[PDB]
Amino acid sequence: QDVVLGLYYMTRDCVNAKGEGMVLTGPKEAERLYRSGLASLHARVKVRIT
Amino acid sequence: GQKVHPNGIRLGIVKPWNSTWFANTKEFADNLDSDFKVRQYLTKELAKASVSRIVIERPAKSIRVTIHTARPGIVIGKKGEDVEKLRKVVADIAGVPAQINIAEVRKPELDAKLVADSITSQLERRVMFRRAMKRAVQNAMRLGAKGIKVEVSGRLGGAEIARTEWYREGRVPLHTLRADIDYNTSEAHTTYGVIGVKVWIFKGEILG
Amino acid sequence: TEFLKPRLVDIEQVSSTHAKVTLEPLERGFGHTLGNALRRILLSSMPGCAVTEVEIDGVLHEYSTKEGVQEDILEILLNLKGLAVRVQGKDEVILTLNKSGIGPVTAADITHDGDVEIVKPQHVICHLTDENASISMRIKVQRGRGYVPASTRIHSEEDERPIGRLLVDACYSPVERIAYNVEAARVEQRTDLDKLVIEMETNGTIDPEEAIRRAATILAEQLEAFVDLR
Amino acid sequence: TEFLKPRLVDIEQVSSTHAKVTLEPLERGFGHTLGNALRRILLSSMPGCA
Amino acid sequence: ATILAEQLEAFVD
Amino acid sequence: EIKELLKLGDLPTSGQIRLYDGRTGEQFERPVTVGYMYMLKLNHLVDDKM
């Protein structure tokens, strides 16, 4: 119950947030942009995943 | 009378004093007398209660007694009923405001005086002295004494010719000043005469 | 490395207890780091003196009642647990409270020594109603940190104490509430600097610059394990 | 009023660009203090060039 | 660690 | 009347205050509900069951 709420709030999206439509060189700097305070947890973004 | 008193030789180093006050030559003797009185009274009273050490300490015209006993419950009785009673009598004896504290003696088998007392009691109620001695020694050892010695003397088993017998176990260094040697004595007033019981209990060496 | 260093520039006392303090200047982003670290340390690990053992005369246990008073003995122990003492020299002192007569027993009636300071002269303890009633308690004030309770202090105590001494729980920490704010600093040539406005709320016994200095030393000596060894 | 200093017990070097600094023991509620302080400094304040 | 220690180096004992 | 009483006190009308985290010092997104509930201790204590 708690963990599906944490995931459903995490992997979602909104039509404008901090860092809308910026491009990221990996998931590591995705978490670094979430922690430093430069993007939001749900902000649509092109990443490069492997 | 060969040996030095083990407490007495160590008062400056590892053992402390019982009466702990300052007084000028004027009031000192009187103070001593008072101490003697109060202590005597306490012994008389708390015979059935296992009492090891009465520590008197008088600051500012007011006497602070500290009774070290194995069972506080019998000395205290009901909470602040017996202690209170004791206090006023102590005060009377002294002629000043009294204050009784009661320290609880952890491990009465390792306290020497208590052991001695027990032995004396046993002797009085007509047990085999030797068996009592053994018990005393064994118990202490079990409890974690680095060593113990006990000695009993005179009219043993009501025999006409008096003698002394003693049991040591572990190590009991008396010449070593830094050794915590709890020494104490007692006297069994039996039907055949007095039987004196000495007991040395070596807790361990102090390093400073 | 173009960093700077902060200083305690202005220390305003809003009252004797509630008192703010600035910090200036902090670098960019450091404000929430130092503020949260000083908050955690200043709430967990400060030394303050508190009541530990209470000794009332003519008492058996803490669940009895007494002659001539309002609050019962558990109420007296709670009102003594709230006390705020500030010793200077020793680390373990014994106070004395003696009072007779009809009226409330404030904290200002304790016969103080020289190096103890009771900073709440309106802290009520008892409400003596009979004029023939008396109360003579002897408090014991240790000094530590954190929270050490009666159950753990039931066997921890080594010094064989006599029976009749009521054991009160020890709330040692004199900090109760702390908030920090990261404003915009007014630097005449820099715009990317900030100030930290720590808003403490003490027990009255602790001096805020001394508390901040001690928390800073705690943090630096904790980080020395990272600095020196690897 | 004396505090527990730790010993740095482990550097499990997984690769040349990987580490895991196992570190014990600290006072109750100090691991989060040290970890969060180091994490925010390492994210948004450590100097370097790119 | 030395960045934070030199940052806090001012008001210590 | 709950909203009007929350306006007499200086509290926010929604009943919800923004709360920071004691661990990380940073704001919880999406403000949370804080209030006073009258909580009771039932007599099913754990050191009568262990």
Next chain:
Amino acid sequence: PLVGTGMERAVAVDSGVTAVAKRGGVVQYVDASRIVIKVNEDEMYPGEAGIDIYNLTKYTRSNQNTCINQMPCVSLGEPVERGDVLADGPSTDLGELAL
């Protein structure tokens, strides 16, 4: 309870765990042992001059091993009326009901 229903008063009075005053008046408040209430003259009988002495039940065993205890919630020299409460029982606060 900050959010109650107002039925706390009737439950805390009507269950006999609080020492509700029988006859109104003032107070003498020895109280260490008992609340002593001087009675106003209108509620007071001609003979049997009379002042009401309430017994407070201190720390004792309930049927569920909890502690039933009464504490006086009136001071010394304070007017009380008939039906008013004097001693707060277990789980009561000034005559209300504090579970």
Next chain:
Amino acid sequence: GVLKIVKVYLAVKRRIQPGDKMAGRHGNKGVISKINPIEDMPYDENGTPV
């Protein structure tokens, strides 16, 4: 009949601990899980922990 009749009344004082049961008035049962420190609590911007 009965000869020696000694009744002794102990009084334990139980505090609260991980494992007790608390509940509100609405049916919200709970077993109190973690007894947190004051610092780790969610504090609002005024400073008071919850």
Next chain:
Amino acid sequence: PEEITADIPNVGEAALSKLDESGIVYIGAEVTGGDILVGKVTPKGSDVKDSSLRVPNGVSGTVIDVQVFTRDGVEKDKRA
């Protein structure tokens, strides 16, 4: 009959403690589990035993009250 005496057997200077010289817990105290409250043991039951009602396992507390309407005789030489 069984007996109310502190002169508790086999068990040593760990019986006579939270009690008086004539037996029974001495009131108040910080008693826990495995303590002794009322020395209550008989001879012929080198054939003595320990029925002395003790404190149950896991509980602590303070003796708040001791009631005794015992077999007309409970007294020692005089508390009764």
Next chain:
Amino acid sequence: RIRIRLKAFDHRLIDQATAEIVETAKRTGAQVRGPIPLPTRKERFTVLISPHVNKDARDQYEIRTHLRLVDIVEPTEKTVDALMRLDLAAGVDVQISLG
């Protein structure tokens, strides 16, 4: 000026007392003179240790009374009074004397 004469049998205890006194002085007032050690009195005693007769058999005891002279140069309002509530450890006879 307040001269203070500390006297005791235990030296460590005396030292402790002296320090405490200094502390008491120094917070309230200013310019405490200092803890000056005077000569110790070594009052000796010889006694015969036999119950009856053996004269060369002897114990030689002594009582070492230590002296500490603490002086306070400026008696303020706050300072002098501070000692009233501030009693020292037992077995240490103090002797304050202003002027």
